[PDB]
Amino acid sequence: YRLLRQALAECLGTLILVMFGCGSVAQVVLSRGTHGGFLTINLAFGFAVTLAILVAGQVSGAHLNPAVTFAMCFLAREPWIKLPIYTLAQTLGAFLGAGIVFGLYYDAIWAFAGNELVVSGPNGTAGIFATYPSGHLDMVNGFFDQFIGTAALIVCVLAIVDPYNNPVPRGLEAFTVGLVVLVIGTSMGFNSGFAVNPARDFGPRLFTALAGWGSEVFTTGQNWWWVPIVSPLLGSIGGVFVYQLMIGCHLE
Amino acid sequence: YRLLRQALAECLGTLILVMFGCGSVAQVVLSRGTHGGFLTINLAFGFAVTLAILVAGQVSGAHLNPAVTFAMCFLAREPWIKLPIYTLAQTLGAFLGAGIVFGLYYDAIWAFAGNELVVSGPNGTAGIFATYPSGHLDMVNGFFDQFIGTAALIVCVLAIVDPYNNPVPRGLEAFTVGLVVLVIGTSMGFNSGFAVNPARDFGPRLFTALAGWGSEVFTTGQNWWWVPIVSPLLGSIGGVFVYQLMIGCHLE
Amino acid sequence: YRLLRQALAECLGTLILVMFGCGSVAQVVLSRGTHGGFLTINLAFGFAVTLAILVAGQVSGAHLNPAVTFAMCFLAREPWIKLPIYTLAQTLGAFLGAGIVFGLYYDAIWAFAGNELVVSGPNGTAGIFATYPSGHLDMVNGFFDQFIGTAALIVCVLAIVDPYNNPVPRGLEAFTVGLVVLVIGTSMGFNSGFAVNPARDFGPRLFTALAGWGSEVFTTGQNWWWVPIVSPLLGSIGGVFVYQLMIGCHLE
Amino acid sequence: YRLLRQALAECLGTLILVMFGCGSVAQVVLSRGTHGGFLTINLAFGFAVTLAILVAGQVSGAHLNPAVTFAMCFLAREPWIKLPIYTLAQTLGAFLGAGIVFGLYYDAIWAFAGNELVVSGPNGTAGIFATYPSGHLDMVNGFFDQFIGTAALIVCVLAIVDPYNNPVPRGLEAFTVGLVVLVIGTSMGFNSGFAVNPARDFGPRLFTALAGWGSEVFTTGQNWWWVPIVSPLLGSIGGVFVYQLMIGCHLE
């Protein structure tokens, strides 16, 4: 089955970027102001996308993003049957990647607040895997951060993918997408990294619910859990319209 | 219309680098010494140029700089009709990119000084979008910073563009220009990023005048607003003469 | 002898990355919080692998890692006779590279604790060349760090090496492997750099035993010296199985 | 004259890297602990070499280093007549590049110690352009830093240049050399950047003698001025022998 081989590549690809991305976030969170800052978090997340694409690019096209997968299906470039398979394959692997990060820092995570698992607060460890609203990053303000961030990601992704452009060889397509992830994190008000990925958010968040953080990861921040899922999906639609209206529709 | 399609690519390209570049500047300015320093500002601005060129390189040549556009027209490589169209397309998109950054940090910008918009000072938010003279960066000292900075940018741009050189494939022409932007910011005494772009300066500055900062953005620093426009234009002329006298005129 | 020429390339390649990698570690350790942090250590180690591969890639394939060499021999891609020759050639050169770093910082290393050589502690200089357990990086916790780290390295290495993929040209195979080394150090809880290399660990550690640190470098941390040797070897086996089960076995 | 065109490319190439490299050093020195650290100095110097090579690579081969030029002449790859012409062309342009940096920071340099120019000390500004011995970087210790640093630079340069290797296309030869410069600065105990270049050292040092710092720049540190000239020259000879004995002589 061709679809099965593409799904396994998406599972391994999302496993690489989540394990590498959330692993660097664990170092900064657990070692408060000692192992680096936000620059290392975005550099690790940005470079992890480059490595993840190179691993699974030749098999499944290296989407590693349900918002990106939704964009190609919306543009009639890929069949709609690939969307549920890729999304489950992208979510399963971010769940697995979060488990590896949990195993790596099992003692440090459990010792952050003594012998308890705290979701949000000063000694909060659930923010390593998922994203939670900040002081100026509430639901209203944070919703537009994912919308604009994902729209910019889709525009840059479609620029290097459109067949009407030059056939960029292998290698100069993961560094570019990895550059977009690094710049988006540095530009937007998100300090977790790769916030424009619904699978990178819901996957590890679902793991934290079963890891021992309880159901509070889904009923906190005025039910914020669905925002990093719906908002990037809307941004993919907006990013597609922006690219098509400006560049896409004029390439005869 | 071919010129219309090239103008739309220049508008989207300047939108990407301004929104990404000024977004990182907003993080450092609003979060004083928390989200990074000048290294992240120049890295984001330098990488944003790489992404912006890759998006619009195959359509309009990816100038994204009125000084760069003036250089090609001066060297008789492009028609003079493209200069007013590209400049307006480069300015419109830096205006739009500044509006997106304003929407992203609307609450944080307005809360920097309580409920007021301050142009310059300790709690100054107008410096996120435009550039203003510093203690050692006055009109006399700052004028030569744009002249030398733009001249070095034009020399590096003409080196990878001259047809007498090797036909560099797609991909190794945005990273190089993006490298020049990053090095120029690190070398020159500008902490805003990409100061050698007249569109990146006048565009967001014009937005701040209508955003709520008043007309003080145009009548401050002994009328500094015209310096980051005329000085890079003179640097493009000087950079063209430097490259032609040393390398350009000797390529038979 | 073809095998002799490949061994000499492996010796020089491991010499470059060890001398460059451990040299940056010496700057941070000796200049406590002055010459940079962990970001510079991983950047130097990651970029040193890129330079080392480019130097010896065209001769011996640029393994520079006994775990990587074990993976290719396990996958029947290289003869088993190359494993003992490459491992000795990789160990000899990390021993030589450590001697160069020792000569560079001979006065600073000896003056860290007055006129004595201390293996572990506050004024510990043996950690520049080798790796020692930390507070949360004991034998049990540190063993899985090398296992997961090396498994991720093998998966990324096999992705760009498998003949069934695109023939990536020279240049886009050292930056990718160098990216993996940089990301692994930023993700995993190791602050020394390139901890997934048995030769980079045992080589300089053997040098410190004869340099003047005594035999305490081999009988400290509950005999930790063998962990960064056996654990990456097991990770190479696990990394091979992960890549083959997900991607490798499905490429007809 | 072919030699005249190659000399003009070497003059412009050394002008780019010196002006960009020393400009970042001026920011860190004048703004004490505000504009960055040693990481930005090595990143700017490393990336400046990449830009300088791309500008003058197609004309003069982009040596930009008398030690590198001496290596090719020693290996009988280039005529010996090119050595005096390239060295003068490399020195003239580092002298010019230092003058541009002086003009950029004329007020800040003169105001470091009031209205005086101090060569060495706390308020020392002559270290921006040239290199001076540190506490642990005296003549005996600093001599071996240039020897090992230049030997590693020559080995990496000869690896990507030898015709027996793959014909690396344009673009993947300036980033590699620029990587070597960045790693060498991070590894070695030099905080100025690109210390393995005799032209980058003597050029700006000669400018400081006539700029107003007096003749003390040549009679300080027990006559240290000749060390960053002779020592890299010896390192080029050692680096050539290392590469030839290990890799060079075995490529039939």
JSON list of C-alpha atoms in Angstrom, two decimals, chain A residues 34-215:
[
{"chain": "A", "resi": 34, "resn": "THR", "atom": "CA", "xyz": [21.04, 28.29, 32.10]},
{"chain": "A", "resi": 35, "resn": "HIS", "atom": "CA", "xyz": [20.93, 26.23, 28.88]},
{"chain": "A", "resi": 36, "resn": "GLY", "atom": "CA", "xyz": [19.96, 29.15, 26.61]},
{"chain": "A", "resi": 37, "resn": "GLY", "atom": "CA", "xyz": [16.91, 31.21, 25.73]},
{"chain": "A", "resi": 38, "resn": "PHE", "atom": "CA", "xyz": [14.28, 31.46, 23.02]},
{"chain": "A", "resi": 39, "resn": "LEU", "atom": "CA", "xyz": [16.94, 31.62, 20.29]},
{"chain": "A", "resi": 40, "resn": "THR", "atom": "CA", "xyz": [18.02, 28.03, 20.97]},
{"chain": "A", "resi": 41, "resn": "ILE", "atom": "CA", "xyz": [14.39, 26.87, 21.08]},
{"chain": "A", "resi": 42, "resn": "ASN", "atom": "CA", "xyz": [13.60, 28.30, 17.65]},
{"chain": "A", "resi": 43, "resn": "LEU", "atom": "CA", "xyz": [16.96, 27.19, 16.21]},
{"chain": "A", "resi": 44, "resn": "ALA", "atom": "CA", "xyz": [16.39, 23.61, 17.39]},
{"chain": "A", "resi": 45, "resn": "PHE", "atom": "CA", "xyz": [12.78, 23.58, 16.18]},
{"chain": "A", "resi": 46, "resn": "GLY", "atom": "CA", "xyz": [13.72, 25.18, 12.86]},
{"chain": "A", "resi": 47, "resn": "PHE", "atom": "CA", "xyz": [16.60, 22.78, 12.24]},
{"chain": "A", "resi": 48, "resn": "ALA", "atom": "CA", "xyz": [14.51, 19.79, 13.34]},
{"chain": "A", "resi": 49, "resn": "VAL", "atom": "CA", "xyz": [12.04, 20.52, 10.54]},
{"chain": "A", "resi": 50, "resn": "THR", "atom": "CA", "xyz": [14.95, 20.50, 8.07]},
{"chain": "A", "resi": 51, "resn": "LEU", "atom": "CA", "xyz": [16.13, 17.10, 9.31]},
{"chain": "A", "resi": 52, "resn": "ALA", "atom": "CA", "xyz": [12.58, 15.71, 9.44]},
{"chain": "A", "resi": 53, "resn": "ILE", "atom": "CA", "xyz": [11.87, 16.78, 5.85]},
{"chain": "A", "resi": 54, "resn": "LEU", "atom": "CA", "xyz": [15.11, 15.26, 4.55]},
{"chain": "A", "resi": 55, "resn": "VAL", "atom": "CA", "xyz": [14.23, 11.95, 6.23]},
{"chain": "A", "resi": 56, "resn": "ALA", "atom": "CA", "xyz": [10.69, 11.66, 4.83]},
{"chain": "A", "resi": 57, "resn": "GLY", "atom": "CA", "xyz": [10.77, 14.01, 1.83]},
{"chain": "A", "resi": 58, "resn": "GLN", "atom": "CA", "xyz": [11.36, 11.33, -0.80]},
{"chain": "A", "resi": 59, "resn": "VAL", "atom": "CA", "xyz": [8.44, 9.18, 0.46]},
{"chain": "A", "resi": 60, "resn": "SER", "atom": "CA", "xyz": [5.45, 11.28, 1.59]},
{"chain": "A", "resi": 61, "resn": "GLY", "atom": "CA", "xyz": [6.50, 14.76, 0.43]},
{"chain": "A", "resi": 62, "resn": "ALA", "atom": "CA", "xyz": [7.37, 15.79, 4.02]},
{"chain": "A", "resi": 63, "resn": "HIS", "atom": "CA", "xyz": [4.29, 17.72, 5.08]},
{"chain": "A", "resi": 64, "resn": "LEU", "atom": "CA", "xyz": [4.65, 17.09, 8.84]},
{"chain": "A", "resi": 65, "resn": "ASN", "atom": "CA", "xyz": [1.86, 19.64, 9.31]},
{"chain": "A", "resi": 66, "resn": "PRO", "atom": "CA", "xyz": [-1.93, 19.15, 9.09]},
{"chain": "A", "resi": 67, "resn": "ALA", "atom": "CA", "xyz": [-2.24, 22.80, 8.04]},
{"chain": "A", "resi": 68, "resn": "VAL", "atom": "CA", "xyz": [0.22, 22.19, 5.19]},
{"chain": "A", "resi": 69, "resn": "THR", "atom": "CA", "xyz": [-1.56, 18.95, 4.25]},
{"chain": "A", "resi": 70, "resn": "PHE", "atom": "CA", "xyz": [-4.90, 20.79, 4.26]},
{"chain": "A", "resi": 71, "resn": "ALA", "atom": "CA", "xyz": [-3.45, 23.41, 1.90]},
{"chain": "A", "resi": 72, "resn": "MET", "atom": "CA", "xyz": [-2.38, 20.93, -0.78]},
{"chain": "A", "resi": 73, "resn": "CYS", "atom": "CA", "xyz": [-5.74, 19.15, -0.58]},
{"chain": "A", "resi": 74, "resn": "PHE", "atom": "CA", "xyz": [-7.50, 22.52, -0.81]},
{"chain": "A", "resi": 75, "resn": "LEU", "atom": "CA", "xyz": [-5.44, 23.38, -3.91]},
{"chain": "A", "resi": 76, "resn": "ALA", "atom": "CA", "xyz": [-6.45, 20.04, -5.51]},
{"chain": "A", "resi": 77, "resn": "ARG", "atom": "CA", "xyz": [-2.79, 18.97, -5.64]},
{"chain": "A", "resi": 78, "resn": "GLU", "atom": "CA", "xyz": [-3.31, 15.91, -3.42]},
{"chain": "A", "resi": 79, "resn": "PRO", "atom": "CA", "xyz": [-6.33, 13.62, -2.92]},
{"chain": "A", "resi": 80, "resn": "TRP", "atom": "CA", "xyz": [-8.62, 14.35, 0.00]},
{"chain": "A", "resi": 81, "resn": "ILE", "atom": "CA", "xyz": [-8.12, 10.78, 1.27]},
{"chain": "A", "resi": 82, "resn": "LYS", "atom": "CA", "xyz": [-4.57, 11.74, 2.29]},
{"chain": "A", "resi": 83, "resn": "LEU", "atom": "CA", "xyz": [-5.78, 14.37, 4.77]},
{"chain": "A", "resi": 84, "resn": "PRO", "atom": "CA", "xyz": [-7.19, 12.01, 7.46]},
{"chain": "A", "resi": 85, "resn": "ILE", "atom": "CA", "xyz": [-4.32, 9.54, 7.01]},
{"chain": "A", "resi": 86, "resn": "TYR", "atom": "CA", "xyz": [-1.59, 12.19, 7.18]},
{"chain": "A", "resi": 87, "resn": "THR", "atom": "CA", "xyz": [-3.20, 13.98, 10.13]},
{"chain": "A", "resi": 88, "resn": "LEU", "atom": "CA", "xyz": [-3.40, 10.77, 12.16]},
{"chain": "A", "resi": 89, "resn": "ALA", "atom": "CA", "xyz": [0.14, 9.89, 11.06]},
{"chain": "A", "resi": 90, "resn": "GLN", "atom": "CA", "xyz": [1.30, 13.39, 12.03]},
{"chain": "A", "resi": 91, "resn": "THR", "atom": "CA", "xyz": [-0.50, 13.28, 15.38]},
{"chain": "A", "resi": 92, "resn": "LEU", "atom": "CA", "xyz": [0.80, 9.76, 16.10]},
{"chain": "A", "resi": 93, "resn": "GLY", "atom": "CA", "xyz": [4.51, 10.49, 16.30]},
{"chain": "A", "resi": 94, "resn": "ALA", "atom": "CA", "xyz": [4.11, 13.80, 18.03]},
{"chain": "A", "resi": 95, "resn": "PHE", "atom": "CA", "xyz": [2.49, 11.67, 20.71]},
{"chain": "A", "resi": 96, "resn": "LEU", "atom": "CA", "xyz": [5.42, 9.26, 20.41]},
{"chain": "A", "resi": 97, "resn": "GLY", "atom": "CA", "xyz": [7.98, 12.07, 20.25]},
{"chain": "A", "resi": 98, "resn": "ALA", "atom": "CA", "xyz": [6.57, 13.59, 23.44]},
{"chain": "A", "resi": 99, "resn": "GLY", "atom": "CA", "xyz": [6.94, 10.23, 25.19]},
{"chain": "A", "resi": 100, "resn": "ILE", "atom": "CA", "xyz": [10.63, 10.10, 24.28]},
{"chain": "A", "resi": 101, "resn": "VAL", "atom": "CA", "xyz": [11.17, 13.62, 25.65]},
{"chain": "A", "resi": 102, "resn": "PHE", "atom": "CA", "xyz": [9.29, 12.58, 28.79]},
{"chain": "A", "resi": 103, "resn": "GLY", "atom": "CA", "xyz": [11.55, 9.56, 29.20]},
{"chain": "A", "resi": 104, "resn": "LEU", "atom": "CA", "xyz": [14.66, 11.67, 28.68]},
{"chain": "A", "resi": 105, "resn": "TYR", "atom": "CA", "xyz": [13.71, 14.18, 31.41]},
{"chain": "A", "resi": 106, "resn": "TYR", "atom": "CA", "xyz": [11.55, 11.95, 33.61]},
{"chain": "A", "resi": 107, "resn": "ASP", "atom": "CA", "xyz": [13.42, 12.73, 36.83]},
{"chain": "A", "resi": 108, "resn": "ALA", "atom": "CA", "xyz": [13.88, 16.44, 36.09]},
{"chain": "A", "resi": 109, "resn": "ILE", "atom": "CA", "xyz": [10.23, 16.97, 35.12]},
{"chain": "A", "resi": 110, "resn": "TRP", "atom": "CA", "xyz": [8.97, 15.21, 38.25]},
{"chain": "A", "resi": 111, "resn": "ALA", "atom": "CA", "xyz": [11.40, 17.16, 40.47]},
{"chain": "A", "resi": 112, "resn": "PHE", "atom": "CA", "xyz": [10.43, 20.61, 39.17]},
{"chain": "A", "resi": 113, "resn": "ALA", "atom": "CA", "xyz": [7.78, 21.03, 41.88]},
{"chain": "A", "resi": 114, "resn": "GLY", "atom": "CA", "xyz": [8.96, 18.31, 44.27]},
{"chain": "A", "resi": 115, "resn": "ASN", "atom": "CA", "xyz": [7.02, 15.15, 43.42]},
{"chain": "A", "resi": 116, "resn": "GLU", "atom": "CA", "xyz": [4.04, 16.64, 41.57]},
{"chain": "A", "resi": 117, "resn": "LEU", "atom": "CA", "xyz": [3.12, 17.44, 37.97]},
{"chain": "A", "resi": 118, "resn": "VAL", "atom": "CA", "xyz": [1.96, 21.06, 37.58]},
{"chain": "A", "resi": 119, "resn": "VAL", "atom": "CA", "xyz": [0.33, 22.14, 34.33]},
{"chain": "A", "resi": 120, "resn": "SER", "atom": "CA", "xyz": [0.66, 25.94, 34.52]},
{"chain": "A", "resi": 121, "resn": "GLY", "atom": "CA", "xyz": [2.41, 28.33, 36.86]},
{"chain": "A", "resi": 122, "resn": "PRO", "atom": "CA", "xyz": [5.98, 29.12, 37.92]},
{"chain": "A", "resi": 123, "resn": "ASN", "atom": "CA", "xyz": [6.93, 25.45, 38.30]},
{"chain": "A", "resi": 124, "resn": "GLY", "atom": "CA", "xyz": [4.93, 24.39, 35.25]},
{"chain": "A", "resi": 125, "resn": "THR", "atom": "CA", "xyz": [6.21, 21.48, 33.19]},
{"chain": "A", "resi": 126, "resn": "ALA", "atom": "CA", "xyz": [3.23, 20.91, 30.86]},
{"chain": "A", "resi": 127, "resn": "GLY", "atom": "CA", "xyz": [4.34, 23.88, 28.75]},
{"chain": "A", "resi": 128, "resn": "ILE", "atom": "CA", "xyz": [7.33, 21.89, 27.49]},
{"chain": "A", "resi": 129, "resn": "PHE", "atom": "CA", "xyz": [5.11, 19.68, 25.31]},
{"chain": "A", "resi": 130, "resn": "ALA", "atom": "CA", "xyz": [2.10, 21.92, 24.56]},
{"chain": "A", "resi": 131, "resn": "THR", "atom": "CA", "xyz": [1.40, 25.66, 24.37]},
{"chain": "A", "resi": 132, "resn": "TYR", "atom": "CA", "xyz": [-0.61, 27.66, 26.90]},
{"chain": "A", "resi": 133, "resn": "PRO", "atom": "CA", "xyz": [-1.79, 31.29, 26.90]},
{"chain": "A", "resi": 134, "resn": "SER", "atom": "CA", "xyz": [0.62, 33.87, 28.31]},
{"chain": "A", "resi": 135, "resn": "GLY", "atom": "CA", "xyz": [-0.09, 37.25, 29.87]},
{"chain": "A", "resi": 136, "resn": "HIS", "atom": "CA", "xyz": [-0.40, 38.97, 26.49]},
{"chain": "A", "resi": 137, "resn": "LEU", "atom": "CA", "xyz": [-1.12, 35.77, 24.54]},
{"chain": "A", "resi": 138, "resn": "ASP", "atom": "CA", "xyz": [-4.73, 35.07, 25.52]},
{"chain": "A", "resi": 139, "resn": "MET", "atom": "CA", "xyz": [-7.33, 33.38, 23.31]},
{"chain": "A", "resi": 140, "resn": "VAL", "atom": "CA", "xyz": [-8.24, 36.53, 21.36]},
{"chain": "A", "resi": 141, "resn": "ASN", "atom": "CA", "xyz": [-4.64, 37.66, 20.87]},
{"chain": "A", "resi": 142, "resn": "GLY", "atom": "CA", "xyz": [-3.24, 34.15, 20.43]},
{"chain": "A", "resi": 143, "resn": "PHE", "atom": "CA", "xyz": [-5.79, 33.16, 17.78]},
{"chain": "A", "resi": 144, "resn": "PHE", "atom": "CA", "xyz": [-4.46, 35.73, 15.31]},
{"chain": "A", "resi": 145, "resn": "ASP", "atom": "CA", "xyz": [-0.87, 34.66, 16.04]},
{"chain": "A", "resi": 146, "resn": "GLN", "atom": "CA", "xyz": [-1.56, 31.19, 14.64]},
{"chain": "A", "resi": 147, "resn": "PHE", "atom": "CA", "xyz": [-3.60, 32.59, 11.75]},
{"chain": "A", "resi": 148, "resn": "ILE", "atom": "CA", "xyz": [-0.92, 34.99, 10.50]},
{"chain": "A", "resi": 149, "resn": "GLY", "atom": "CA", "xyz": [1.91, 32.60, 11.33]},
{"chain": "A", "resi": 150, "resn": "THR", "atom": "CA", "xyz": [0.39, 29.69, 9.43]},
{"chain": "A", "resi": 151, "resn": "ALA", "atom": "CA", "xyz": [-0.57, 31.92, 6.49]},
{"chain": "A", "resi": 152, "resn": "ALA", "atom": "CA", "xyz": [3.06, 33.03, 6.16]},
{"chain": "A", "resi": 153, "resn": "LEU", "atom": "CA", "xyz": [4.18, 29.40, 6.41]},
{"chain": "A", "resi": 154, "resn": "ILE", "atom": "CA", "xyz": [1.78, 28.27, 3.67]},
{"chain": "A", "resi": 155, "resn": "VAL", "atom": "CA", "xyz": [2.85, 31.10, 1.35]},
{"chain": "A", "resi": 156, "resn": "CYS", "atom": "CA", "xyz": [6.53, 30.20, 1.74]},
{"chain": "A", "resi": 157, "resn": "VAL", "atom": "CA", "xyz": [5.83, 26.48, 1.38]},
{"chain": "A", "resi": 158, "resn": "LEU", "atom": "CA", "xyz": [3.79, 26.96, -1.80]},
{"chain": "A", "resi": 159, "resn": "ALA", "atom": "CA", "xyz": [6.51, 29.18, -3.28]},
{"chain": "A", "resi": 160, "resn": "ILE", "atom": "CA", "xyz": [9.12, 26.39, -3.31]},
{"chain": "A", "resi": 161, "resn": "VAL", "atom": "CA", "xyz": [6.58, 23.70, -4.23]},
{"chain": "A", "resi": 162, "resn": "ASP", "atom": "CA", "xyz": [4.63, 25.17, -7.17]},
{"chain": "A", "resi": 163, "resn": "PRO", "atom": "CA", "xyz": [5.61, 23.27, -10.36]},
{"chain": "A", "resi": 164, "resn": "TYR", "atom": "CA", "xyz": [5.65, 26.50, -12.40]},
{"chain": "A", "resi": 165, "resn": "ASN", "atom": "CA", "xyz": [8.82, 27.58, -10.59]},
{"chain": "A", "resi": 166, "resn": "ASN", "atom": "CA", "xyz": [12.34, 26.22, -11.00]},
{"chain": "A", "resi": 167, "resn": "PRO", "atom": "CA", "xyz": [12.83, 22.54, -10.08]},
{"chain": "A", "resi": 168, "resn": "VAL", "atom": "CA", "xyz": [14.74, 23.12, -6.84]},
{"chain": "A", "resi": 169, "resn": "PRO", "atom": "CA", "xyz": [16.92, 20.05, -6.15]},
{"chain": "A", "resi": 170, "resn": "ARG", "atom": "CA", "xyz": [16.82, 18.00, -2.98]},
{"chain": "A", "resi": 171, "resn": "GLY", "atom": "CA", "xyz": [18.34, 19.81, -0.02]},
{"chain": "A", "resi": 172, "resn": "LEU", "atom": "CA", "xyz": [17.20, 23.34, -0.83]},
{"chain": "A", "resi": 173, "resn": "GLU", "atom": "CA", "xyz": [13.65, 22.59, 0.29]},
{"chain": "A", "resi": 174, "resn": "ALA", "atom": "CA", "xyz": [14.10, 21.53, 3.94]},
{"chain": "A", "resi": 175, "resn": "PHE", "atom": "CA", "xyz": [16.45, 24.39, 4.84]},
{"chain": "A", "resi": 176, "resn": "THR", "atom": "CA", "xyz": [13.93, 26.87, 3.43]},
{"chain": "A", "resi": 177, "resn": "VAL", "atom": "CA", "xyz": [10.97, 25.41, 5.33]},
{"chain": "A", "resi": 178, "resn": "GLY", "atom": "CA", "xyz": [13.20, 25.10, 8.39]},
{"chain": "A", "resi": 179, "resn": "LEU", "atom": "CA", "xyz": [14.07, 28.77, 7.92]},
{"chain": "A", "resi": 180, "resn": "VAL", "atom": "CA", "xyz": [10.37, 29.69, 7.92]},
{"chain": "A", "resi": 181, "resn": "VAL", "atom": "CA", "xyz": [9.77, 27.84, 11.19]},
{"chain": "A", "resi": 182, "resn": "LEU", "atom": "CA", "xyz": [12.75, 29.57, 12.83]},
{"chain": "A", "resi": 183, "resn": "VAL", "atom": "CA", "xyz": [11.72, 33.04, 11.63]},
{"chain": "A", "resi": 184, "resn": "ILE", "atom": "CA", "xyz": [8.06, 32.56, 12.60]},
{"chain": "A", "resi": 185, "resn": "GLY", "atom": "CA", "xyz": [9.01, 31.67, 16.17]},
{"chain": "A", "resi": 186, "resn": "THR", "atom": "CA", "xyz": [11.35, 34.66, 16.40]},
{"chain": "A", "resi": 187, "resn": "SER", "atom": "CA", "xyz": [8.74, 37.01, 14.91]},
{"chain": "A", "resi": 188, "resn": "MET", "atom": "CA", "xyz": [5.55, 35.81, 16.59]},
{"chain": "A", "resi": 189, "resn": "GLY", "atom": "CA", "xyz": [4.90, 36.02, 20.31]},
{"chain": "A", "resi": 190, "resn": "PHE", "atom": "CA", "xyz": [5.27, 32.28, 20.87]},
{"chain": "A", "resi": 191, "resn": "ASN", "atom": "CA", "xyz": [8.20, 30.99, 22.94]},
{"chain": "A", "resi": 192, "resn": "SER", "atom": "CA", "xyz": [7.43, 27.27, 22.52]},
{"chain": "A", "resi": 193, "resn": "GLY", "atom": "CA", "xyz": [8.40, 26.81, 18.87]},
{"chain": "A", "resi": 194, "resn": "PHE", "atom": "CA", "xyz": [6.58, 25.68, 15.70]},
{"chain": "A", "resi": 195, "resn": "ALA", "atom": "CA", "xyz": [3.22, 26.91, 16.97]},
{"chain": "A", "resi": 196, "resn": "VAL", "atom": "CA", "xyz": [1.78, 26.74, 13.43]},
{"chain": "A", "resi": 197, "resn": "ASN", "atom": "CA", "xyz": [1.63, 22.93, 13.57]},
{"chain": "A", "resi": 198, "resn": "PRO", "atom": "CA", "xyz": [-1.64, 21.41, 14.86]},
{"chain": "A", "resi": 199, "resn": "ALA", "atom": "CA", "xyz": [0.00, 17.99, 15.20]},
{"chain": "A", "resi": 200, "resn": "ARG", "atom": "CA", "xyz": [2.94, 19.37, 17.19]},
{"chain": "A", "resi": 201, "resn": "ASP", "atom": "CA", "xyz": [0.42, 20.93, 19.60]},
{"chain": "A", "resi": 202, "resn": "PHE", "atom": "CA", "xyz": [-2.40, 18.40, 20.01]},
{"chain": "A", "resi": 203, "resn": "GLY", "atom": "CA", "xyz": [-0.10, 15.36, 19.94]},
{"chain": "A", "resi": 204, "resn": "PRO", "atom": "CA", "xyz": [2.09, 16.17, 22.94]},
{"chain": "A", "resi": 205, "resn": "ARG", "atom": "CA", "xyz": [-0.90, 17.78, 24.68]},
{"chain": "A", "resi": 206, "resn": "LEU", "atom": "CA", "xyz": [-2.80, 14.49, 24.44]},
{"chain": "A", "resi": 207, "resn": "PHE", "atom": "CA", "xyz": [0.26, 12.71, 25.84]},
{"chain": "A", "resi": 208, "resn": "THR", "atom": "CA", "xyz": [0.39, 15.03, 28.87]},
{"chain": "A", "resi": 209, "resn": "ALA", "atom": "CA", "xyz": [-3.22, 14.15, 29.68]},
{"chain": "A", "resi": 210, "resn": "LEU", "atom": "CA", "xyz": [-2.26, 10.47, 30.02]},
{"chain": "A", "resi": 211, "resn": "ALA", "atom": "CA", "xyz": [1.29, 11.06, 31.28]},
{"chain": "A", "resi": 212, "resn": "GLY", "atom": "CA", "xyz": [0.11, 12.23, 34.70]},
{"chain": "A", "resi": 213, "resn": "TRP", "atom": "CA", "xyz": [-0.82, 15.89, 34.28]},
{"chain": "A", "resi": 214, "resn": "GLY", "atom": "CA", "xyz": [-4.53, 15.04, 34.41]},
{"chain": "A", "resi": 215, "resn": "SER", "atom": "CA", "xyz": [-7.34, 16.46, 32.33]}
]
